[PDB]
Amino acid sequence: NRPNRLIVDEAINEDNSVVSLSQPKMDELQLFRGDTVLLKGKKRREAVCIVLSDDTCSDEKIRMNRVVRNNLRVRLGDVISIQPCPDVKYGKRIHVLPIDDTVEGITGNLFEVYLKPYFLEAYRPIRKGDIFLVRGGMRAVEFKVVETDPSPYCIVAPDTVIHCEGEPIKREDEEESLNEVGYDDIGGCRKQLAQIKEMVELPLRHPALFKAIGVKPPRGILLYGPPGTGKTLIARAVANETGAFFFLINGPEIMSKLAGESESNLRKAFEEAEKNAPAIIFIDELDAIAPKREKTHGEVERRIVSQLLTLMDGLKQRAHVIVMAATNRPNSIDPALRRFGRFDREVDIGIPDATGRLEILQIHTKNMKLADDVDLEQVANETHGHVGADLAALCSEAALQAIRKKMDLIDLEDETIDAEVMNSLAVTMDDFRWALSQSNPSALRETVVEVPQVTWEDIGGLEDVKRELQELVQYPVEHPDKFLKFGMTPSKGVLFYGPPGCGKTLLAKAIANECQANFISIKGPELLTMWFGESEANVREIFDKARQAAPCVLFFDELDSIAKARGGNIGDGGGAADRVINQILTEMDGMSTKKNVFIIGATNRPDIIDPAILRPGRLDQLIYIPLPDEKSRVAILKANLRKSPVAKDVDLEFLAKMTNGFSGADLTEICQRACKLAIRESIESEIVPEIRRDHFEEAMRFARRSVSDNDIRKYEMFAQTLQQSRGFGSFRFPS
Amino acid sequence: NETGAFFFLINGPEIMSKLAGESESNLRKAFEEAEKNAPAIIFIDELDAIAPKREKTHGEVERRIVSQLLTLMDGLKQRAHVIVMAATNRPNSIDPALRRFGRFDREVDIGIPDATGRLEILQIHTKNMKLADDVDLEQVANETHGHVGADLAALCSEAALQAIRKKMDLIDLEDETIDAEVMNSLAVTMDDFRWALSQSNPSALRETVVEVPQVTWEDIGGLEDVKRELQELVQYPVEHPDKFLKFGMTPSKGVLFYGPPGCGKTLLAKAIANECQANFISIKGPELLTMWFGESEANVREIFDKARQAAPCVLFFDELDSIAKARGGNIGDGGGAADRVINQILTEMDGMSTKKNVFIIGATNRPDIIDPAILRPGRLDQLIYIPLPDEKSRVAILKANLRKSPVAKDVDLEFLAKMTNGFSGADLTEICQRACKLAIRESIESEIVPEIRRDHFEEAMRFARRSVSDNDIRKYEMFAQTLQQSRGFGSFRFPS
Ligand SMILES: Cc1cc2c(C(N)=O)cccc2n1-c1nc2c(c(NCc3ccccc3)n1)COCC2
Ligand SMILES: Cc1cc2c(C(N)=O)cccc2n1-c1nc2c(c(NCc3ccccc3)n1)COCC2
Ligand SMILES: Nc1ncnc2c1ncn2[C@@H]1O[C@H](COP(=O)(O)OP(=O)(O)O)[C@@H](O)[C@H]1O
């Protein structure tokens, strides 16, 4: 079967011309890490690149870049043959010129100022009839060769000369512009984008197989998340890189036109897409199409909603059309649109984490050069409530300040702006310091679903809790098989209790990292808001988005907030049962045990917690979080001081030994007071940048202890209320 | 298709899709074109989208179309054979004027298939795709309970794409026409189905599950006192209808039993349903307390409606005292023990027919706060007490918990059940769970044995709780021979 062709996929490397393979790949073709490789394809064209060795990408797979996928005219799901080509090449004369589509506003020489600097120390090959793309110079421009030395023998070298004629040649329809959006342009959405690959690549890349088998492909995908998360360029990229006819309808334009032709327009949208098979239809605004919850107004609204329902219901085999849609909330859509055959597959995307946000900055700043002291990693750390469009706007906004701080002194007012100054436009760090000050982000109060960064290693002590948490949620995650072998269902959730300020939230975060699971935190105010507001559909989406992000962990902070607000143990004439806890009970009863979703309840007063939530099957597992011991207190001190200059003589072991009945909050305020004293001494001494032993010794005087002994006694009475290890302590079997 | 009748399908959204004025004409001419194709059959797919006459009250054309349908179905004389079937989600989501005589008199309610019902629905959708010798569809239809018939139809295809994707990467056969000599080798694997139940999010999860249980009286040991009265209280009117008309005694409408928590009240009700071969409907506490807080009290209407159409059925109310606990209990507020939800249940139970085989079972752990009116004769006059499991019944609880675990020969469950006396079913359950946890932990740590050993149970026996106190047993008994009263007339002699 000629075992030489392999499938093509996307490369995670950010390099321009780098091809990554697996370990048993170059050992068969006896090629080194800097040899010459020749690749072929359709249209009777060849290619040449540089093979790079990598053993971390995958097990047996070849990577392949975007700048050459369009150059060789290759699309996904195709076969590619690779063979070594040890041919000595040497370029002598070159002649490249850009296309008159991206050179607007550029004058003067442009060959000895951009092309010469980037060619050196690269030795990149080039074949005849190729459109390479280069990023930099505050723009995205390309060049095309029309006449040079006979192919091949093309090697870049500083000794090579170049020349120009002065007449750009327009591009044709055979090639595709690389300025559009592809898979490499998506940053942060890794797990969510991975799903669309296994749902839209089968029907669009292999049509004859679907008109051969009886499998019904999905007829609709609903994307989610707040505006700006990137629901549109995802749909445009999965169309641009799949060769499917992308047809965009926004959703407000349907209501923009007169009543009577709006239905006809999105009707004919479906037939014009069908004849362009394979096709892909994306509806940008859908909550503005079917808000069938409180509107109940407008004869044409229902007519358009039903017209869409009919157009998507009659999606038989016929041709390959995929109808994706975007909206903000799951409940803001007509439930009749969620039926089978209209929207069966739903993918929810959200705010990218720090790692997800880091990869979204450089994609938007690849054109603007940075300085040696400008790092994008630290700027994606203090921001947590920024949507993907927020940072896209922030990059440009910093760019105007960067150019404004120099145009005042340059004072070059003319009709046409010379292209010899963009090379000197380097952004500074102060350009970004102002960027996070006046920028007001949109998505700030939402469910942050991110994997934490706190592990068990950075938590000292608490071996008693470490051992039971690891055997209660980690075992069903890392060893599913040993549970079916023993016929034991995993526990649904655990509620732990303890004095305030002892790290219950951090413990839940740490157990999420051990299982490599997502983490969702619901604090007290979010739980008590729906109690006062009499709006109790909010737990529905909480439990919905907790289960779609499998595997996840659900954490409820200060669960006793409603009981405290109602009175507690007695309060009013009623008991300890309310409506919000009832909704949580209903949602937990209906969950599937085979899923890896896990609910963790945190409380400081477990005596006022409703007994029904602790019933077996919901939160039967109760563990007690005590005060940190000597080993765990050092961890709290060093976590607080990990960002501060600590002197060598400042011994944290002794400080943690001295404080015994101290909570995490008590150590936190000790560290904060020491830092305040150090800052004040540094400020007053100006008229030293190191925290000294005296700072901690003096701040140790105002040492509080917020947790009293009576509290520890009342928590214990609760603890071996449920321990009861009496009676059957000594048992001997007969034989 | 199998009756040779002209099938004409109208969805229901297409009526609202077209302009106002011809939509009425289209579903009008739909009826005459069906009549001349006699015999005919008309099915309306979306009907809740046609007549949502409960909260809409908006749109002149909506009422016009609803009335046009009412006129088209009212004028259904003999003439020709046309049958107008329709589909909708809820009974209350339909215009009540459509339920009149001559429009929709016959109603059939279908629901989620059970494990047996789901098993026969898999192979019909996978008859074309060949399976392996280790792929069994029975075990995959067991852990799923909230899957609609379309859910598994989608799941089969979804597993098919994974099955072909795991091999197309290595086959690497890219061409225009795909050869037919490879489908014969497309065999689905069990791992194709393991991933299928992970990312698939089912739709119907929070609904009334109406299925026949699988727990019988044989697997329940002991409880002969309750076995004898339950068998003579609901089984007799089901298996011997004639002996009741012969003796002129009406069957009891329902029985409420009480007992300490975690003793198997739900399992007892399930077992008595299998003995009578009757359907079982369970209503837990949260579903009862949701409508109390929500002030939405039409929910008991459909509960009692779907409990009576599935004749014969058994209706089970779990923790009936939930509303009383939420309101305070014996005293609580200035009010008594009467509320709105229990009032609706009383109204629905008073209006039921005794000749039907529907049966209501109430379960509670605090019968002192139960409203007295629900225990009035004719509604729940029969009260039976569920005690702690005895030695014979505790072995059943242990073996039910351990029926899926590797039990060693030396592990004697009879002795373990003998040792624990005042232990509830929950206490034995946590003992078994703790022993399984210890065995799993030892197996995991020993890797760096696949059998539960005697030591696992012996060590886990140390943390043996007893959640039910003696004061609780005393307070339940005070309630029990509160209503026993076998004094006074204990010795009677007739004259002759
Ligand atoms: C700033 C900080 C404040 C704080 C508090 C508090 N009431 O201020 C309570 C518990 C932990 C706390 N931390 C804290 N924060 C961190 C860590 C850490 N050490 C491990 C730990 C966790 C729970 C328990 C013990 C010790 N402690 C470890 O690395 C991540 C951040
Ligand atoms: C897992 C299980 C837990 C449990 C509990 C509990 N609070 O954990 C209470 C009562 C019965 C329980 N079962 C249980 N489950 C089953 C059976 C069975 N034995 C019969 C029985 C029923 C009620 C009573 C006695 C004994 N017991 C029998 O086969 C079906 C499943
Ligand atoms: N997750 C993301 N990855 C890459 N770019 C993004 C992302 N989210 C937003 N952007 C950028 O923000 C800009 C605005 O996106 P926008 O059209 O608001 O997305 P949507 O239509 O989904 O709200 C786009 O040009 C896009 O490049």
PDB file of N, CA and C and ligand atoms in Angstrom, chain A residues 616, chain B residues 214-216 219-221 223 261-265 267-268 389 393-394 396-401 403 424-430, ligand 2:
ATOM      1  N   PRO A 616     -27.099  10.566  52.372  1.00  0.00           N
ATOM      2  CA  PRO A 616     -26.245   9.697  51.553  1.00  0.00           C
ATOM      3  C   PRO A 616     -26.616   9.796  50.081  1.00  0.00           C
TER       4      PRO A 616
ATOM      5  N   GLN B 214     -37.254  -3.960  39.076  1.00  0.00           N
ATOM      6  CA  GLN B 214     -36.652  -5.280  38.939  1.00  0.00           C
ATOM      7  C   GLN B 214     -36.412  -5.960  40.281  1.00  0.00           C
ATOM      8  N   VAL B 215     -36.819  -5.339  41.384  1.00  0.00           N
ATOM      9  CA  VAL B 215     -36.605  -5.873  42.724  1.00  0.00           C
ATOM     10  C   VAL B 215     -37.868  -6.599  43.163  1.00  0.00           C
ATOM     11  N   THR B 216     -37.717  -7.865  43.545  1.00  0.00           N
ATOM     12  CA  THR B 216     -38.816  -8.738  43.908  1.00  0.00           C
ATOM     13  C   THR B 216     -38.782  -8.991  45.417  1.00  0.00           C
ATOM     14  N   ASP B 219     -35.647 -11.366  46.735  1.00  0.00           N
ATOM     15  CA  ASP B 219     -34.363 -10.772  47.084  1.00  0.00           C
ATOM     16  C   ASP B 219     -34.426  -9.970  48.378  1.00  0.00           C
ATOM     17  N   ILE B 220     -35.619  -9.714  48.903  1.00  0.00           N
ATOM     18  CA  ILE B 220     -35.771  -9.084  50.209  1.00  0.00           C
ATOM     19  C   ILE B 220     -35.974 -10.186  51.240  1.00  0.00           C
ATOM     20  N   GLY B 221     -35.025 -10.321  52.156  1.00  0.00           N
ATOM     21  CA  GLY B 221     -35.158 -11.270  53.238  1.00  0.00           C
ATOM     22  C   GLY B 221     -35.927 -10.676  54.404  1.00  0.00           C
ATOM     23  N   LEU B 223     -38.821  -9.367  57.007  1.00  0.00           N
ATOM     24  CA  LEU B 223     -39.954  -8.449  56.916  1.00  0.00           C
ATOM     25  C   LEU B 223     -41.233  -9.193  56.536  1.00  0.00           C
ATOM     26  N   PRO B 261     -35.013   6.611  59.075  1.00  0.00           N
ATOM     27  CA  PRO B 261     -34.444   6.834  57.743  1.00  0.00           C
ATOM     28  C   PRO B 261     -33.458   5.744  57.354  1.00  0.00           C
ATOM     29  N   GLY B 262     -33.359   5.516  56.048  1.00  0.00           N
ATOM     30  CA  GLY B 262     -32.445   4.527  55.513  1.00  0.00           C
ATOM     31  C   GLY B 262     -32.787   3.099  55.881  1.00  0.00           C
ATOM     32  N   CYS B 263     -34.063   2.736  55.773  1.00  0.00           N
ATOM     33  CA  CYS B 263     -34.480   1.369  56.055  1.00  0.00           C
ATOM     34  C   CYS B 263     -35.124   0.661  54.874  1.00  0.00           C
ATOM     35  N   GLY B 264     -35.245   1.300  53.715  1.00  0.00           N
ATOM     36  CA  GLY B 264     -35.717   0.612  52.529  1.00  0.00           C
ATOM     37  C   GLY B 264     -37.190   0.789  52.232  1.00  0.00           C
ATOM     38  N   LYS B 265     -37.755   1.937  52.613  1.00  0.00           N
ATOM     39  CA  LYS B 265     -39.158   2.196  52.305  1.00  0.00           C
ATOM     40  C   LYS B 265     -39.404   2.256  50.803  1.00  0.00           C
ATOM     41  N   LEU B 267     -37.522   0.788  48.472  1.00  0.00           N
ATOM     42  CA  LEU B 267     -37.346  -0.564  47.960  1.00  0.00           C
ATOM     43  C   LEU B 267     -38.551  -1.445  48.256  1.00  0.00           C
ATOM     44  N   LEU B 268     -39.172  -1.291  49.429  1.00  0.00           N
ATOM     45  CA  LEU B 268     -40.358  -2.082  49.736  1.00  0.00           C
ATOM     46  C   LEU B 268     -41.493  -1.758  48.773  1.00  0.00           C
ATOM     47  N   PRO B 389     -34.191  -3.450  59.965  1.00  0.00           N
ATOM     48  CA  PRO B 389     -34.055  -4.804  59.422  1.00  0.00           C
ATOM     49  C   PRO B 389     -33.597  -5.777  60.496  1.00  0.00           C
ATOM     50  N   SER B 393     -33.166  -9.999  57.316  1.00  0.00           N
ATOM     51  CA  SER B 393     -33.199  -8.918  56.342  1.00  0.00           C
ATOM     52  C   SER B 393     -31.866  -8.205  56.180  1.00  0.00           C
ATOM     53  N   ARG B 394     -31.025  -8.186  57.214  1.00  0.00           N
ATOM     54  CA  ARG B 394     -29.720  -7.548  57.097  1.00  0.00           C
ATOM     55  C   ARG B 394     -28.790  -8.287  56.147  1.00  0.00           C
ATOM     56  N   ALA B 396     -29.701  -9.671  53.453  1.00  0.00           N
ATOM     57  CA  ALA B 396     -30.117  -9.165  52.153  1.00  0.00           C
ATOM     58  C   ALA B 396     -29.499  -7.813  51.837  1.00  0.00           C
ATOM     59  N   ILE B 397     -29.450  -6.899  52.807  1.00  0.00           N
ATOM     60  CA  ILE B 397     -28.840  -5.595  52.567  1.00  0.00           C
ATOM     61  C   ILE B 397     -27.351  -5.739  52.280  1.00  0.00           C
ATOM     62  N   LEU B 398     -26.651  -6.578  53.048  1.00  0.00           N
ATOM     63  CA  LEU B 398     -25.230  -6.793  52.784  1.00  0.00           C
ATOM     64  C   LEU B 398     -24.999  -7.380  51.397  1.00  0.00           C
ATOM     65  N   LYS B 399     -25.753  -8.416  51.028  1.00  0.00           N
ATOM     66  CA  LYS B 399     -25.526  -9.049  49.737  1.00  0.00           C
ATOM     67  C   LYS B 399     -25.970  -8.180  48.568  1.00  0.00           C
ATOM     68  N   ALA B 400     -26.952  -7.301  48.761  1.00  0.00           N
ATOM     69  CA  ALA B 400     -27.310  -6.354  47.712  1.00  0.00           C
ATOM     70  C   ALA B 400     -26.176  -5.375  47.445  1.00  0.00           C
ATOM     71  N   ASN B 401     -25.533  -4.888  48.506  1.00  0.00           N
ATOM     72  CA  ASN B 401     -24.380  -4.014  48.355  1.00  0.00           C
ATOM     73  C   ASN B 401     -23.185  -4.730  47.745  1.00  0.00           C
ATOM     74  N   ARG B 403     -23.206  -7.470  45.809  1.00  0.00           N
ATOM     75  CA  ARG B 403     -23.510  -8.292  44.644  1.00  0.00           C
ATOM     76  C   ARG B 403     -22.654  -7.949  43.433  1.00  0.00           C
ATOM     77  N   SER B 424     -29.271   0.315  60.777  1.00  0.00           N
ATOM     78  CA  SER B 424     -30.160   0.599  59.664  1.00  0.00           C
ATOM     79  C   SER B 424     -29.526   0.136  58.357  1.00  0.00           C
ATOM     80  N   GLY B 425     -30.314   0.169  57.283  1.00  0.00           N
ATOM     81  CA  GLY B 425     -29.775  -0.176  55.980  1.00  0.00           C
ATOM     82  C   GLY B 425     -28.653   0.753  55.561  1.00  0.00           C
ATOM     83  N   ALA B 426     -28.765   2.035  55.913  1.00  0.00           N
ATOM     84  CA  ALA B 426     -27.698   2.984  55.629  1.00  0.00           C
ATOM     85  C   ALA B 426     -26.422   2.665  56.393  1.00  0.00           C
ATOM     86  N   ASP B 427     -26.536   2.165  57.626  1.00  0.00           N
ATOM     87  CA  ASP B 427     -25.346   1.819  58.396  1.00  0.00           C
ATOM     88  C   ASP B 427     -24.599   0.652  57.766  1.00  0.00           C
ATOM     89  N   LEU B 428     -25.325  -0.381  57.338  1.00  0.00           N
ATOM     90  CA  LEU B 428     -24.697  -1.472  56.607  1.00  0.00           C
ATOM     91  C   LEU B 428     -24.145  -1.007  55.266  1.00  0.00           C
ATOM     92  N   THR B 429     -24.834  -0.074  54.604  1.00  0.00           N
ATOM     93  CA  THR B 429     -24.362   0.436  53.323  1.00  0.00           C
ATOM     94  C   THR B 429     -23.012   1.118  53.461  1.00  0.00           C
ATOM     95  N   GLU B 430     -22.860   1.987  54.457  1.00  0.00           N
ATOM     96  CA  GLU B 430     -21.572   2.638  54.652  1.00  0.00           C
ATOM     97  C   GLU B 430     -20.503   1.671  55.127  1.00  0.00           C
TER      98      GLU B 430
HETATM   99  C1  LIG C   2     -28.005  -0.809  48.458  1.00  0.00           C
HETATM  100  C2  LIG C   2     -29.218  -0.995  49.364  1.00  0.00           C
HETATM  101  C3  LIG C   2     -29.065   0.063  50.230  1.00  0.00           C
HETATM  102  C4  LIG C   2     -30.099   0.029  51.120  1.00  0.00           C
HETATM  103  C5  LIG C   2     -30.440   0.852  52.204  1.00  0.00           C
HETATM  104  C6  LIG C   2     -29.641   2.077  52.641  1.00  0.00           C
HETATM  105  N1  LIG C   2     -30.263   3.068  53.500  1.00  0.00           N
HETATM  106  O1  LIG C   2     -28.528   2.228  52.271  1.00  0.00           O
HETATM  107  C7  LIG C   2     -31.572   0.582  52.954  1.00  0.00           C
HETATM  108  C8  LIG C   2     -32.368  -0.505  52.638  1.00  0.00           C
HETATM  109  C9  LIG C   2     -32.034  -1.318  51.569  1.00  0.00           C
HETATM  110  C10 LIG C   2     -30.887  -1.041  50.809  1.00  0.00           C
HETATM  111  N2  LIG C   2     -30.333  -1.671  49.726  1.00  0.00           N
HETATM  112  C11 LIG C   2     -30.869  -2.842  49.073  1.00  0.00           C
HETATM  113  N3  LIG C   2     -30.953  -2.863  47.726  1.00  0.00           N
HETATM  114  C12 LIG C   2     -31.453  -3.934  47.104  1.00  0.00           C
HETATM  115  C13 LIG C   2     -31.885  -4.985  47.820  1.00  0.00           C
HETATM  116  C14 LIG C   2     -31.801  -4.952  49.192  1.00  0.00           C
HETATM  117  N4  LIG C   2     -32.247  -6.069  49.999  1.00  0.00           N
HETATM  118  C15 LIG C   2     -33.653  -6.228  50.302  1.00  0.00           C
HETATM  119  C16 LIG C   2     -34.115  -5.246  51.375  1.00  0.00           C
HETATM  120  C17 LIG C   2     -34.933  -4.185  51.033  1.00  0.00           C
HETATM  121  C18 LIG C   2     -35.359  -3.298  52.007  1.00  0.00           C
HETATM  122  C19 LIG C   2     -34.970  -3.479  53.321  1.00  0.00           C
HETATM  123  C20 LIG C   2     -34.156  -4.545  53.663  1.00  0.00           C
HETATM  124  C21 LIG C   2     -33.729  -5.431  52.690  1.00  0.00           C
HETATM  125  N5  LIG C   2     -31.302  -3.892  49.801  1.00  0.00           N
HETATM  126  C22 LIG C   2     -32.462  -6.221  47.051  1.00  0.00           C
HETATM  127  O2  LIG C   2     -32.308  -6.279  45.647  1.00  0.00           O
HETATM  128  C23 LIG C   2     -32.461  -5.004  45.012  1.00  0.00           C
HETATM  129  C24 LIG C   2     -31.552  -3.977  45.594  1.00  0.00           C
END
